[PDB]
Amino acid sequence: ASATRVIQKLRNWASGQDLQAKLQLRYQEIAKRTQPPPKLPVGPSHKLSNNYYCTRDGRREVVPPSIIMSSQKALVSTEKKAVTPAPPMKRWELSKDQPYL
Amino acid sequence: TSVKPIFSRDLNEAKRRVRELYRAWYREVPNTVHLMQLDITVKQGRDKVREMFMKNAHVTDPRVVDLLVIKGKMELQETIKVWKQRTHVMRFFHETETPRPKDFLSKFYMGHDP
Amino acid sequence: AGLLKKTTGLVGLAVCDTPHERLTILYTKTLDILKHFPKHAAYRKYTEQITNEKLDMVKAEPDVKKLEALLQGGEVEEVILQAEKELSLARKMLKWKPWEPLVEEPPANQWKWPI
Amino acid sequence: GVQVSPSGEKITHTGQVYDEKDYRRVRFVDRQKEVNENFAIDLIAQQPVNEVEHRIIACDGGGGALGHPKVYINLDKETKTGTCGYCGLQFKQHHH
Amino acid sequence: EEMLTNNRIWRNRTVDIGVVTAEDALNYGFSGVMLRGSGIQWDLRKTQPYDVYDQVEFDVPIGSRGDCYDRYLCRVEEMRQSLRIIEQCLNKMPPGEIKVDDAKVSPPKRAEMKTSMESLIHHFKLYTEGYQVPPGATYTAIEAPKGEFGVYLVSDGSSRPYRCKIKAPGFAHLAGLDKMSKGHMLADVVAIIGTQDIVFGEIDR
Amino acid sequence: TYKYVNKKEQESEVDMKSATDNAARILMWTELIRGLGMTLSYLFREPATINYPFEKGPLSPRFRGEHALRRYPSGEERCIACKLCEAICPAQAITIEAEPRADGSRRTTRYDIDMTKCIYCGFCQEACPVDAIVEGPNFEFSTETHEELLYNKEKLLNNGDKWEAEIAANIQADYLYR
Amino acid sequence: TQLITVDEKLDITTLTGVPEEHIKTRKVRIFVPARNNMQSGVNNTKKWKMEFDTRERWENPLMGWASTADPLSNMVLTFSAKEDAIAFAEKNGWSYDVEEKKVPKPKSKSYGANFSWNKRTRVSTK
Amino acid sequence: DMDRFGVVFRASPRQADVMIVAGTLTNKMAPALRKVYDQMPEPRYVVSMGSCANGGGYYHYSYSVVRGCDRIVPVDIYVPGCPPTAEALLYGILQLQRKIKREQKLKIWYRR
Amino acid sequence: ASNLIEVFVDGQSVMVEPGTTVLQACEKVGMQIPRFCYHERLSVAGNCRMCLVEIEKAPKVVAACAMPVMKGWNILTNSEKSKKAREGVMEFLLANHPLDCPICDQGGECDLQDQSMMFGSDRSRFLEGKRAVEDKNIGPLVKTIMTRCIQCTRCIRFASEIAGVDDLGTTGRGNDMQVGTYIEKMFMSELSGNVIDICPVGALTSKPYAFTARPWETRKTESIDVMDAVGSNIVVSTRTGEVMRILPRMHEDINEEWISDKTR
Amino acid sequence: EMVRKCDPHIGLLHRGTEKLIEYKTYLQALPYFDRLDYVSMMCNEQAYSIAVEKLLNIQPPPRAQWIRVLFGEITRILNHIMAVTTHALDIGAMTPFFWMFEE
Amino acid sequence: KRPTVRPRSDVTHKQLSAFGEYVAEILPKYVQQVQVSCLDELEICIHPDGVIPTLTFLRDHTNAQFKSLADLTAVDVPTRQNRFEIVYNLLSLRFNSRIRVKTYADELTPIDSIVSVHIAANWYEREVWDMFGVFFFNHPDLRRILTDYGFEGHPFRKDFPLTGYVELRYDDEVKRVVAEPVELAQEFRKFDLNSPWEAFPAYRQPP
Numbered sequence A: 001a002s003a004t005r006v007i008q009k010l011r012n013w014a015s016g017q018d019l020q021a022k023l024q025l026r027y028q029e030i031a032k033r034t035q036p037p038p039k040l041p042v043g044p045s046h047k048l049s050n051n052y053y054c055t056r057d058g059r060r061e062v063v064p065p066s067i068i069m070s071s072q073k074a075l076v077s078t079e080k081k082a083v084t085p086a087p088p089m090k091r092w093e094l095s096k097d098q099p100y101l
Numbered sequence B: 001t002s003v004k005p006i007f008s009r010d011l012n013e014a015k016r017r018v019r020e021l022y023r024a025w026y027r028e029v030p031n032t033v034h035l036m037q038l039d040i041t042v043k044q045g046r047d048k049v050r051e052m053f054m055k056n057a058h059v060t061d062p063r064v065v066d067l068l069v070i071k072g073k074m075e076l077q078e079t080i081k082v083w084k085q086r087t088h089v090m091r092f093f094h095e096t097e098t099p100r101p102k103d104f105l106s107k108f109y110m111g112h113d114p
Numbered sequence C: 001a002g003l004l005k006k007t008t009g010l011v012g013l014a015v016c017d018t019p020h021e022r023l024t025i026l027y028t029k030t031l032d033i034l035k036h037f038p039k040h041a042a043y044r045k046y047t048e049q050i051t052n053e054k055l056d057m058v059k060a061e062p063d064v065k066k067l068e069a070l071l072q073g074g075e076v077e078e079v080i081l082q083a084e085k086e087l088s089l090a091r092k093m094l095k096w097k098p099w100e101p102l103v104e105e106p107p108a109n110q111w112k113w114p115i
Numbered sequence D: 001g002v003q004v005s006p007s008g009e010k011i012t013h014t015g016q017v018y019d020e021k022d023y024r025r026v027r028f029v030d031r032q033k034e035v036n037e038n039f040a041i042d043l044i045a046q047q048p049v050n051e052v053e054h055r056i057i058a059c060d061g062g063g064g065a066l067g068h069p070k071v072y073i074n075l076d077k078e079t080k081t082g083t084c085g086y087c088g089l090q091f092k093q094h095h096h
Numbered sequence E: 001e002e003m004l005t006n007n008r009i010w011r012n013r014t015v016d017i018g019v020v021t022a023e024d025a026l027n028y029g030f031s032g033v034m035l036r037g038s039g040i041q042w043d044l045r046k047t048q049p050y051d052v053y054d055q056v057e058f059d060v061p062i063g064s065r066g067d068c069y070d071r072y073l074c075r076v077e078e079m080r081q082s083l084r085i086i087e088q089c090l091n092k093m094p095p096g097e098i099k100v101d102d103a104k105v106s107p108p109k110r111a112e113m114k115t116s117m118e119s120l121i122h123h124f125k126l127y128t129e130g131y132q133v134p135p136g137a138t139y140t141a142i143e144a145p146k147g148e149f150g151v152y153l154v155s156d157g158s159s160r161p162y163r164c165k166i167k168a169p170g171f172a173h174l175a176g177l178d179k180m181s182k183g184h185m186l187a188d189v190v191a192i193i194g195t196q197d198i199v200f201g202e203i204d205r
Numbered sequence F: 001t002y003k004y005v006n007k008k009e010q011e012s013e014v015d016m017k018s019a020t021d022n023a024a025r026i027l028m029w030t031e032l033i034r035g036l037g038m039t040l041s042y043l044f045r046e047p048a049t050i051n052y053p054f055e056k057g058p059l060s061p062r063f064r065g066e067h068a069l070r071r072y073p074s075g076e077e078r079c080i081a082c083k084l085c086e087a088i089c090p091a092q093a094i095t096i097e098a099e100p101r102a103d104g105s106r107r108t109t110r111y112d113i114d115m116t117k118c119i120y121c122g123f124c125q126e127a128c129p130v131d132a133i134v135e136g137p138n139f140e141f142s143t144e145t146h147e148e149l150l151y152n153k154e155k156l157l158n159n160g161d162k163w164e165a166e167i168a169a170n171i172q173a174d175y176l177y178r
Numbered sequence G: 001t002q003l004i005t006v007d008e009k010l011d012i013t014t015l016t017g018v019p020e021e022h023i024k025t026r027k028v029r030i031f032v033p034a035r036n037n038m039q040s041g042v043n044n045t046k047k048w049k050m051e052f053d054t055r056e057r058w059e060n061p062l063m064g065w066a067s068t069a070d071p072l073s074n075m076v077l078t079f080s081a082k083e084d085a086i087a088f089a090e091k092n093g094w095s096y097d098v099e100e101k102k103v104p105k106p107k108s109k110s111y112g113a114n115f116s117w118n119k120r121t122r123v124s125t126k
Numbered sequence H: 001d002m003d004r005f006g007v008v009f010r011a012s013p014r015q016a017d018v019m020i021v022a023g024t025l026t027n028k029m030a031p032a033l034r035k036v037y038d039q040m041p042e043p044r045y046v047v048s049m050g051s052c053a054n055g056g057g058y059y060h061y062s063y064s065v066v067r068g069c070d071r072i073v074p075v076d077i078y079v080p081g082c083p084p085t086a087e088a089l090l091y092g093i094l095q096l097q098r099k100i101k102r103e104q105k106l107k108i109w110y111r112r
Numbered sequence I: 001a002s003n004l005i006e007v008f009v010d011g012q013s014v015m016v017e018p019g020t021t022v023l024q025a026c027e028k029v030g031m032q033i034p035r036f037c038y039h040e041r042l043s044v045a046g047n048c049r050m051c052l053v054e055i056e057k058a059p060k061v062v063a064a065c066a067m068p069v070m071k072g073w074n075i076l077t078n079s080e081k082s083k084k085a086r087e088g089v090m091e092f093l094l095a096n097h098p099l100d101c102p103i104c105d106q107g108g109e110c111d112l113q114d115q116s117m118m119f120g121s122d123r124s125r126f127l128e129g130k131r132a133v134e135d136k137n138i139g140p141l142v143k144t145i146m147t148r149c150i151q152c153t154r155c156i157r158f159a160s161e162i163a164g165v166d167d168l169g170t171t172g173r174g175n176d177m178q179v180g181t182y183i184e185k186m187f188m189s190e191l192s193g194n195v196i197d198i199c200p201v202g203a204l205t206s207k208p209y210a211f212t213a214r215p216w217e218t219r220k221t222e223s224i225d226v227m228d229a230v231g232s233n234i235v236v237s238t239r240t241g242e243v244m245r246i247l248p249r250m251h252e253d254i255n256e257e258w259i260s261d262k263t264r
Numbered sequence J: 001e002m003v004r005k006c007d008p009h010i011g012l013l014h015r016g017t018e019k020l021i022e023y024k025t026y027l028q029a030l031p032y033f034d035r036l037d038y039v040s041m042m043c044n045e046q047a048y049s050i051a052v053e054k055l056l057n058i059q060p061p062p063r064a065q066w067i068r069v070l071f072g073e074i075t076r077i078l079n080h081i082m083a084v085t086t087h088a089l090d091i092g093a094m095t096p097f098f099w100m101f102e103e
Numbered sequence K: 001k002r003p004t005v006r007p008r009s010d011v012t013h014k015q016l017s018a019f020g021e022y023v024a025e026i027l028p029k030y031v032q033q034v035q036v037s038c039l040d041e042l043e044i045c046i047h048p049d050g051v052i053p054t055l056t057f058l059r060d061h062t063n064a065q066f067k068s069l070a071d072l073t074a075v076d077v078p079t080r081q082n083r084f085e086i087v088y089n090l091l092s093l094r095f096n097s098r099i100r101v102k103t104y105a106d107e108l109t110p111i112d113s114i115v116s117v118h119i120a121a122n123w124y125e126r127e128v129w130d131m132f133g134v135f136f137f138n139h140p141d142l143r144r145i146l147t148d149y150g151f152e153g154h155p156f157r158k159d160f161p162l163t164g165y166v167e168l169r170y171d172d173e174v175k176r177v178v179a180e181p182v183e184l185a186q187e188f189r190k191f192d193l194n195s196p197w198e199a200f201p202a203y204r205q206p207p
């Protein structure tokens, strides 16, 4: 900003852009260093009723993996259809703003 | 008592491989004391080769022998090529490791170690 | 008609000016080789399903682009690549013979987790 | 306070100092031994007893979330004085 | 970009250099830009999303010639799309808490630790022992700026992992160097080391 | 979605004007003159260089640098030898030995930190339930000797007695966000 | 590639880079860790452990920390059974002294015994 | 700005005057580090940057880390941090400048 | 056949002698039910009510520490009712418990901590003021801090049934029930330091071992005692080449869980 | 100067991270993922956290996820800056390094 | 619906289970103990004689196009007689799905390489060899990858000490970097942290 209406013109022409509106330096356009105190919120599990950890325990809804074709034990394993691990990934669509840079 | 063999179906073929490896090392030692500018003779190197070979003379399973030969060929590659410097080669000689005595009484005088 | 596309997007993947013919060739070859398999082999049945399905798709649609969209395999060159891959796999499986009992069962607790 | 030993080395608040015959004092030759001259025991002793009219008082230290966990102290024994376990503040039942 | 993109020297250094075919890339195990510059449509932020991705719009830059130039362009445009994403993350950021409201995984706040017994216990335990993790094994991968960064994490019913391998994008990228360098010179090999975005803290680790 | 970066090129149409423009670009070095102009523009801009050690780089209260053991305003030490700090220190840099102080309180005799092992992670000050161990703002504590970087209870206590005026204010600022 | 007749005891020492010292002069201990009497939990008395002999620990003159020349000072391995641990030890060439597992004996317990007419189970502390 | 102080990164050890050990030093890399240092011409100084270089740091108890670069080369100044703020590394550079301010070599030669 | 009876634990069946309790059966199938007052060598007392389980097709919950097992009973250890009973009992135990974990020598080896983390809730809805109790002084070996007593009566039952002193009891009633003696009296027997081991909540602690370490630091070496000729089995806890304490082991034939003060 | 074979010899910066981690807890092991790729830190923390959360069967809250995405993209920008500029340096162009490191 | 727990969909479970049945009945000669997890992940365990056939089928087959080798690991479990659990994590871009294949090995029981299938496995198998001691067959250049040039041992084996057996320094006498037995100023402190109370009753091991 210290520039003087001539160096600014010169460098804006040399670069081809309006740099004075977009500066690499921070002149008082930044949040202060001394902010007020906050009042953080609390999550949903801060109630005093209908809050039993036995309901909201996900760490214990886990279960050992389901077993197919276990040979050494049970669950060993018209004709069926050829199956996939998942349906084929769809084809993407090119953007509508800048698809051809 | 029945297992899968890695390369050798018996100890004699493993011994053939071990001998091939000994020949390779015995032939290489001079080239690497020349190249690496080691400050030892050619006899010390071959004595060290023989000692490292005898270090595992007690083995009888051909699979352990095959894996030892694989490791030895890996090292011989690292050495034929200069991927390893004189530092790693002289690591074998332990020029600084104070040699712990095998005398029960000295081991008794210095420390509680058996 | 829809001219041979100027180029795919994948690098090293050349355009095929005879896509409908290459596909028929490869699928008919795959079928002809799947006969040497035992009929109870699941590889044979499944691969016959897939190949006849895609072959009928090819015979039903000459439009390369509608075929692409009807075949869910990307470009028609990726499909040809996968056809020849499946053919080579059919050969290799004829050689390996996986349609046989389990070669060896595991020791007692090899897949027990935790332990 | 910071008392010295026959060798001149200062005794820390832990009671630690090297013996005159200890070789480990060369590290302090041409250098110094860093001690903390503000012994917390003497300081917390210099503080007075806070009287109270309730038999059970709490202590968070000070500043709330800037102190220590809130503990409750019984003050029945009129001869003794209740001391927080985190801080060393003393409390006494005013009316006994 | 003005310094580099349309400069004939940068082009002569990064064009037709370090070429990778799509199938060779897949096989060698590339990921990210090393995969897109060759023309492969793949991004773990649109496929297999792992966070509010799928709530934030952005475009994937794709190359045609799998050369150092197309990858450089992909990276520039990924930076631009990162700006596009940051704009949305700023404008739509929800109120609420920041860590799971389950004090057996995420420690409780200080003011609650210093007045609540349960929270103090949980803090003490999370910070001395930790949280027990039910047994199992995952392979989670994200679209790190280098590529697919993944971790195979095996757990007993303990507070410590039994095995944690890091899958680093750069291991396979560097393994592919001998191939990508075939028919090239030293300076080209430098350019190729660069176009892979190589960092060795993840490769050697 | 996706976009192309170098496929924009379409079928070739060429005129005399286009040919002459490309020729001038190839003969007069147009595109390079623009990089020259950019570098020129940067010459007439203000450099981002600060004049260290007189004017210094910004920081935030949360900055975690040098460690210090604090006290209560009475002068009593905040540490109670609970040992969470060394139980979590992922570098195993902390070392503690406790003993009943003569007055009966629970206090330490040893509290050592190998600042060559600390990764400056902050886990110790978020584990301390009494806000005793902190990671102060000071980062200008380099030495000429490795031994100087092995802090004990007295060193950390002196640092606390040296920076309290700053540590306390930064805490007062940041302690609502925790 | 058919099978082979080895007919000997396994030995892996030569493939583990373990020095002669820490194979010949090491006595492993195999045991089920004993319950900690400060707690009534019995979940760490299930898996068999392998622990090595303790060696010297000398204060460091500078600070006063504990030093060692024992790499295996903190080696602990976890096994599901005793034979597995014995096999691992034999394999790696170590010497072991095993310690059987201590299970508490089942105990008769009755809340009425606390209230009896003629026996000494009669308690005076309700 | 380093050059502001006269500092310039030269890539050849035969032209350098100081080496900043900026990160972890493995056993596979220590020979090369000692070789490079040896190849630097006296007067040569060394600066340990970070906690990995000073005492191994977060990887102190690893099988592939030297617990301090001061085992392989002699160190003039230790810069702590993980990582050290660039401001701190500059503080260390200037500390080195002062240490050099206090070499007093020719006075010693004249006193001999 | 020999008077055994079939019983289930979440379906799994097990045959148990008559008089066997729910707790012993759940153990016989590898399940350990929470506890604060049952100790396997002391008279039963249904005080903590932390052992509560529900029985299939039964309205209320029974104390597994004291209820004998009946034929065909199915015991639901991990059902909603059991979980909620445990959570409630934890709320109640921790309501008046002091925030002392970082000055409590029992930290890291506290049954209350682990049972709160494994069976209880992670929050406090207590918005009131706790209580406090003036600490006793029963001797130079056992340190008493009775704001942390959960009134489990183990100390009392041990002193009476195993040591044979009958000097400990409960003074008062209600929430102001003060375990301990009514008068100043040193509780110096030769089996006194075991009350430390059976007090789960650090109210009773070793004055020697006070503050000196934490359980995770210690390395535990299994050894034996020599002060006597009984051969008591012990664990020797060490911390950086230094003996920190002596802690007993289990040997049903010698020293089931006890050792003399001279030994520890 | 024509290259006929490249033999990358990695391992000069192996540290045993994957073993120390076994010797640590999960939180106590998190910083390794920052120290792994040291120009895209937050992404590694994010992968680790996501894996641990999967194993725990918990869901981080919305605001935390949005912050994770914000800083993940900021790290993408950091890493692409570093990549492009070191690329240029190793090729000859040196000024972009200085222009973008101020950012 | 609950905000802390993780949303769970059974559709992916079903998809992966059906594909697991597919693989099991199309490769019976090798497949053992297919299984799927609470988190949606497919795990196919096999006999090591089936490595190359399984991986080639999963790469080349049409309904299975796992042609990107993400990772290749090992896992030391000293308990079982075959310690090393070799893992092959794979990815299908055509189906946006992953899969994991596992085998088992031993100190003296090598397996076959898959560089003929996935060239990405050269360095990963070198890493497995350097870290655990598993030897692979028909590998072009099987040497060390991460360890020092004269390093003895396989450090990721649970039986290998975290700090190793040797330690490096510089000796003016010889003017070289030398390797001496380990000796520490502070010994690593082993913390026993496992709680003695069962934490997850769904994984309880019956006696």
Ligand SMILES: CCCCCCCCCCCCCCCCCC(=O)OC[C@H](COP(=O)(O)OCCN)OC(=O)CCCCCCCCCCCCCCCCC
Pocket: E008, F026, F027, F028, F029, F032
């Ligand atoms: C009737 C008329 C009769 C008289 C007959 C003459 C008629 C006029 C003819 C005018 C001809 C134009 C002047 C000739 C000079 C330019 C030569 C040239 O064009 O070389 C171009 C060369 C190739 O560029 P490239 O894009 O890679 O194309 C490759 C081909 N496919 O690339 C280059 O050579 C340029 C790249 C060089 C890069 C190095 C850095 C350059 C720095 C630029 C500084 C500019 C400042 C000039 C200062 C001059 C002051 C002395």
Ligand code: SF4
Pocket: F085, F088, F089, F090, F091, F092, F093, F094, F113, F117, F118, F119, F120, F121, F122, F123, F124, F125, F135
């Ligand atoms: S900041 Fe982290 S590494 Fe440093 S002392 Fe504290 S807990 Fe340890």
Ligand code: SF4
Pocket: F078, F079, F080, F081, F082, F083, F084, F085, F086, F096, F124, F127, F128, F129, F130, F131, F132, F133, I102
């Ligand atoms: S966490 Fe705080 S109170 Fe506890 S030992 Fe460490 S410094 Fe002391």
Ligand code: SF4
Pocket: F119, H022, H023, H024, H049, H050, H051, H052, H053, H057, H058, H081, H082, H083, H084, J035, J038
């Ligand atoms: S930032 Fe930390 S981990 Fe990285 S090299 Fe520096 S000290 Fe080591």
Ligand code: SF4
Pocket: I148, I149, I150, I151, I152, I153, I154, I155, I156, I179, I198, I199, I200, I201, I203, I204
């Ligand atoms: S003092 Fe301890 S053992 Fe005695 S009743 Fe209270 S908690 Fe139980």
Ligand code: SF4
Pocket: E121, I097, I098, I099, I100, I101, I102, I104, I105, I106, I107, I108, I110, I111, I112, I113, I148, I200, I201, I202, I203
């Ligand atoms: S008894 Fe347990 S819960 Fe109570 S203060 Fe002591 S450690 Fe904490």
Ligand code: FES
Pocket: I034, I035, I036, I037, I038, I045, I046, I047, I048, I049, I050, I051, I052, I063, I064, I065, I066
């Ligand atoms: S264990 Fe049953 S009431 Fe205490």
Ligand SMILES: [Zn+2]
Pocket: D059, D060, D061, D068, D084, D085, D086, D087, D088, D089
């Ligand atoms: Zn207080």
